[PDB]
Design an enzyme around this catalytic site. Structure first.
Site, PDB file in Angstrom:
ATOM      1  CG  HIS A   1      -0.220   0.001   2.540  1.00 43.91           C
ATOM      2  ND1 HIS A   1       0.073   1.128   3.281  1.00 43.91           N
ATOM      3  CD2 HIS A   1       0.284  -1.042   3.234  1.00 43.91           C
ATOM      4  CE1 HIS A   1       0.701   0.770   4.386  1.00 43.91           C
ATOM      5  NE2 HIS A   1       0.853  -0.540   4.377  1.00 43.91           N
TER       6      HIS A   1
ATOM      7  CE1 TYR B   1       5.375   5.833  -4.379  1.00 46.33           C
ATOM      8  CE2 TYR B   1       7.423   6.294  -5.536  1.00 46.33           C
ATOM      9  CZ  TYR B   1       6.382   5.443  -5.235  1.00 46.33           C
ATOM     10  OH  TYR B   1       6.360   4.199  -5.810  1.00 46.33           O
TER      11      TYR B   1
END
Ligand SMILES: NC(=O)C1=CN([C@@H]2O[C@H](COP(=O)(O)OP(=O)(O)OC[C@H]3O[C@@H](n4cnc5c(N)ncnc54)[C@H](OP(=O)(O)O)[C@@H]3O)[C@@H](O)[C@H]2O)C=CC1
Ligand SMILES: NC(=O)C1=CN([C@@H]2O[C@H](COP(=O)(O)OP(=O)(O)OC[C@H]3O[C@@H](n4cnc5c(N)ncnc54)[C@H](OP(=O)(O)O)[C@@H]3O)[C@@H](O)[C@H]2O)C=CC1
Ligand SMILES: NC(=O)C1=CN([C@@H]2O[C@H](COP(=O)(O)OP(=O)(O)OC[C@H]3O[C@@H](n4cnc5c(N)ncnc54)[C@H](OP(=O)(O)O)[C@@H]3O)[C@@H](O)[C@H]2O)C=CC1
Ligand SMILES: NC(=O)C1=CN([C@@H]2O[C@H](COP(=O)(O)OP(=O)(O)OC[C@H]3O[C@@H](n4cnc5c(N)ncnc54)[C@H](OP(=O)(O)O)[C@@H]3O)[C@@H](O)[C@H]2O)C=CC1
Ligand SMILES: C[C@H](CCC(=O)NCCC[N+](C)(C)CCCS(=O)(=O)[O-])[C@H]1CC[C@H]2[C@@H]3[C@H](O)C[C@@H]4C[C@H](O)CC[C@]4(C)[C@H]3C[C@H](O)[C@]12C
Ligand SMILES: C[C@H](CCC(=O)NCCC[N+](C)(C)CCCS(=O)(=O)[O-])[C@H]1CC[C@H]2[C@@H]3[C@H](O)C[C@@H]4C[C@H](O)CC[C@]4(C)[C@H]3C[C@H](O)[C@]12C
Ligand SMILES: C[C@H](CCC(=O)NCCC[N+](C)(C)CCCS(=O)(=O)[O-])[C@H]1CC[C@H]2[C@@H]3[C@H](O)C[C@@H]4C[C@H](O)CC[C@]4(C)[C@H]3C[C@H](O)[C@]12C
Ligand SMILES: C[C@H](CCC(=O)NCCC[N+](C)(C)CCCS(=O)(=O)[O-])[C@H]1CC[C@H]2[C@@H]3[C@H](O)C[C@@H]4C[C@H](O)CC[C@]4(C)[C@H]3C[C@H](O)[C@]12C
Lengths: 258, 258, 269, 270
Positions: free
Chosen positions: B101, B164
């Site tokens: 995830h 990220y």
């Protein structure tokens, strides 16, 4: 970025307005002293109020254009924000942001210590991002520089420093990405990541007592790298380390992919 | 660790007890389906109970030994901890933990987005650590495996994905360090880090709207690597990518420095 | 160590330069660039007829002087006598550009030991003979040796076994004497050029299909070789693609050579 | 090529038919001794019959299936060719060709000894090619192996060994190219290139006296690692006192680029 095709000279820092974090002891303190000798304006920070005052007084003796401290913990993101705003007011701007502090780190196996993982990520990584965001308007004004102090354990993996390594790897990912962004968006703020071997700070010598390069020289090489707007600085007692740890293939692939 | 010296066979997953996170869509869903076809026991998680129920129903049709879902957000570290306990209870242990995830991420310049940096670090990194801590007793019992899904932007620097990238770099630092610790401490739990190029998930195709690799094949290669206890899996449409991105010198230096 | 300046064509004005394999291909282009820069040039190859044309064009382009001496580099006596003659004619020597090769086509090795030997003699041993003959003059001028090599002189390819052996040998030999010159304080530079596909007639006859369209221009290639030599660079890498010139470099080799260098005592020599 | 996916066992060499050149002393002699202990058939060569005879005597005692010597100089390409034929006749075939000889080399600056350069190229490089050509039909029959002994100075540059380094670099270029040709032509003969650091042979120990102060690896262990690598059909063997050397000198990027480059071209043609 494009580094300066120039020899370093200490006059490059003369009258420059520089923040040094983690500057009460170790490498950060030595950086403050070098900057002071070069005639920079300096604002130093760490938690240790009384030691910071002594650092400031010595910086003035050494010839700093000006020197002030602000004490606080970089676990507090509001403190981080407010610190940069006040440091900027104290100096009338900002040319260089040297991010150097870390939370207490010793050699231990990772057993279930999610608190240390979180604290390491907050202090060693997130606070650097918060400081950068707060500093960026001033650095854009001055075409300034961000210097991020990192580690061999921020480039390769070691046992016994898992949480720390996570945080130092995160710095590489984050700051190397925004470096690419500043290149394409023509933001004239340099980003220098420093990769350090064993340095003879009290912290390190106590940490490795059950298993070193001079902190004064280390501190100078970090400053030189930032002043010359180099992408990375590698510093260690041995050329075996500094020459072999470099990964030129990464930089080549980043270029070719772009 | 030492990778199994044998070719992959789907029977290697038969009756194995596997958690897949981020399994409502994309690569995670495809991994659940492959595991189902191999006759594994699977527990899937993501936020959406409706979509998870559809995945569970398809897993049972495909031949899963058992299939369950537990819905929640990995923003909630209490959920992460309790999820692993409940998944293990449902299956009677745990052979493989597939951590996949991520928080919602698109391509954008970083400006003053501390919120996304924190969220990315919490969902993409800290929750993986919490899940691992919760799973480790069961994995030690089974001599099992942790599979961490990562990215080209977790090995080299790209613009537009700074938050990220920080989180994926952090994974490498953390999990590669604990891998070293498990070796010295003789903990027989394998850690596989997967480095993925562009994969044709709906999320990716919307975000980049070059050749995208098929998500079904990607999923299978992740499972194969975990099952074979490989340190790293590299997957991309092009061999130029998967062969050149590898950094064997890092592994060599880590060994020499030990 | 290399000069820390930008290349300027005036760096070759009045310089005395030998170019081998200079009747066609990259060697001819090098002679033409040198002529445009106002160098003194002596060119060589086997064919007097093609060399005559190169000399005449060199003069038209503005060479300070231009001359040929024809012969085969299969003959080591010719190699030795050629350098002496060329240097005497020009009154010295500033740069020795070693570029010739024996005729090579692409094919599986097929027990043709004669070709392996001929490759080694022409492509490698003659370069050493030429160097020995030139070195006194190059020491006098603090000059430069330029050795033209190949991708197949740095990594392995099928179909060029004999040629690759010879180009690998050049790297081993010339890279070793570079280290010797460093310790013996001989101020003569050595530049090894690693070339990808270049659109010479020879190459365009040898390769197949769309590979032809992936060739770099011989005129540009020649200039980059000269620039590398003038700037005293250790290596020049030239290809139509940055994927090639960036990825083919092996910086680890030079790092290890440096790290290994402290462990032997050269005082005897 | 594809290496055997299994652990070495000495029985892999039992009854195998092996040539070892430069086998009167040093690493070659140790290779002959290991092969003998494994029960191989061995034919050894070098110039000196006296020292070869001693090697054969010890091989027979150690348990070689058979052991013979043939003396001659690898400066003579006619001897090289005829040697392989005679060795093949003595053993009734050939499974492994171990190419190990070199011309006498000492540490010196290069000045003008073109004679030494030529002799190095002829003995250290061209004779290996001649031996390979002579051996290949027998090796194709046995799906055999060629082992080429090389050097750190065959992968990176050093002063004082220019002629030698040229010859060892040439071996890499040539044999690495033929390995690629055997892959496209489907010739099931393996080629193993060995890259050696300082090994405690008498030659090396005399040569480096006063110049070098580092650890020297045992010649017995070196020889065994070369045989193991050849037996397992590995492309390259790296051997040294230190893992720092063997791990860092390898250049996996070269092998990767060669592979990537090969996917671009069609070898059906020439
Ligand atoms: N020394 C070495 O061998 C190596 C060092 N490095 C790096 O170099 C940098 C400096 O290391 P070094 O000088 O050894 O470390 P020190 O422990 O000597 O210095 C750390 C500094 O950060 C401060 N600090 C600690 N906690 C906090 C907090 N919560 N908030 C704000 N400041 C804090 C300290 O002061 P106070 O206690 O007063 O708050 C101290 O000034 C670090 O980034 C590190 O990762 C990297 C690799 C090796
Ligand atoms: N596709 C690609 O090109 C690439 C993918 N990767 C990696 O592969 C992995 C999968 O990517 P991909 O399949 O494309 O992603 P998708 O967006 O297709 O799937 C993401 C999954 O995570 C879930 N998720 C999102 N937010 C949360 C949350 N707060 N808590 C719990 N679960 C959440 C989603 O379910 P829901 O929304 O229902 O919660 C969804 O199931 C990622 O780790 C990624 O970094 C790496 C490089 C490239
Ligand atoms: N073109 C390419 O793609 C590549 C070129 N290179 C290198 O660049 C260099 C030049 O290549 P290129 O320009 O294509 O070659 P050409 O075939 O165009 O030129 C070869 C030259 O050498 C001469 N020559 C041939 N045999 C002998 C001999 N026995 N004695 C003396 N001279 C001889 C020729 O003239 P004559 O026949 O009259 O003697 C000719 O002048 C070579 O070193 C080569 O290895 C490397 C990689 C690729
Ligand atoms: N020892 C080391 O440190 C290193 C060794 N190597 C390599 O290992 C290999 C063996 O080296 P090492 O064992 O030290 O060498 P030795 O000097 O011990 O042995 C060389 C052998 O070759 C023979 N030889 C010499 N000249 C000729 C000739 N003209 N024809 C046929 N045979 C000849 C010798 O016997 P004879 O004189 O009777 O003919 C001797 O048998 C060599 O290929 C070398 O390049 C590489 C790096 C380092
Ligand atoms: C000392 C070790 C290992 C350094 C290393 O691995 N160095 C290169 C190889 C050296 N070797 C001798 C193995 C080979 C040399 C080859 S040579 O031939 O040259 O001898 C390094 C690795 C991780 C480092 C710690 C982390 O940062 C976290 C923390 C930061 C603080 O601020 C200071 C304290 C602390 C604990 C750090 C101290 C020290 O810094 C550590 C332990
Ligand atoms: C597509 C690009 C670049 C990939 C790349 O750089 N690939 C190798 C180079 C290929 N070349 C350019 C050289 C082509 C030549 C072909 S050749 O054969 O010549 O090599 C990669 C780099 C970062 C990736 C994103 C992040 O992960 C975050 C996020 C994760 C989600 O889950 C899916 C969405 C998203 C936005 C990702 C999508 C995509 O995945 C990105 C944009
Ligand atoms: C063409 C090939 C391969 C070049 C190569 O491997 N190049 C980099 C990789 C390129 N890719 C595969 C990635 C394709 C990219 C295409 S792209 O358009 O994207 O750039 C190279 C390798 C060996 C080369 C020969 C030798 O020297 C001997 C001889 C010298 C003469 O003087 C000219 C003739 C000849 C036969 C030479 C011709 C040519 O020079 C050869 C065949
Ligand atoms: C000894 C040197 C250098 C080896 C080297 O560079 N080795 C790796 C580096 C090791 N370090 C110093 C960095 C660390 C050691 C730490 S230590 O604790 O060991 O001191 C190597 C390099 C070239 C080698 C010669 C050639 O082959 C030619 C010839 C072949 C014969 O057959 C034997 C004789 C001879 C003269 C060879 C001997 C020796 O073999 C030489 C001199």
């Amino acid at each position: 970025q494009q580094p300066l095709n120039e020899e370093f000279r200490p006059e490059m820092l003369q009258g420059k307005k520089v923040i040094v974090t983690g500057a009460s002891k170790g490498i950060g303190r030595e950086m403050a002293y070098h900057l002071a000798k070069m005639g920079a304006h300096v604002v130093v920070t760490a938690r240790s109020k009384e030691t910071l005052q002594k650092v400031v007084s010595h910086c003035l003796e050494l010839g700093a254009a000006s020197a002030h401290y602000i004490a606080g913990t970089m676990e507090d993101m509001t403190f981080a924000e407010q610190f940069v705003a006040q440091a900027g007011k104290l100096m009338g701007g900002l040319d260089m942001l040297i991010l150097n502090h870390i939370t207490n780190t010793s050699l231990n196996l990772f057993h279930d210590d999610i608190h240390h993982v979180r604290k390491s990520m907050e202090v060693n990584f997130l606070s650097y991002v918060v400081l950068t965001v707060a500093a960026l308007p001033m650095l854009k004004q001055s075409n300034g520089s961000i210097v991020v102090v990192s580690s061999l354990a921020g480039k390769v993996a070691y046992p016994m420093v898992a949480a720390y390594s996570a945080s130092k790897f995160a710095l590489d990912g984050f700051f190397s990405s925004i470096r690419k962004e500043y290149s394409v968006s023509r933001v004239n703020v340099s980003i220098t990541l420093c990769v350090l071997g064993l340095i003879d700070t009290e912290t390190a010598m106590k940490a490795v007592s059950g298993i070193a390069a001079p902190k004064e020289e280390c501190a100078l090489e970090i400053i030189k790298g930032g002043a010359l707007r180099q992408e990375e600085v590698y510093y260690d007692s041995s050329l075996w380390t500094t020459l072999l740890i470099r990964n030129p293939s990464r930089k080549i692939l980043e270029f070719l992919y772009s």
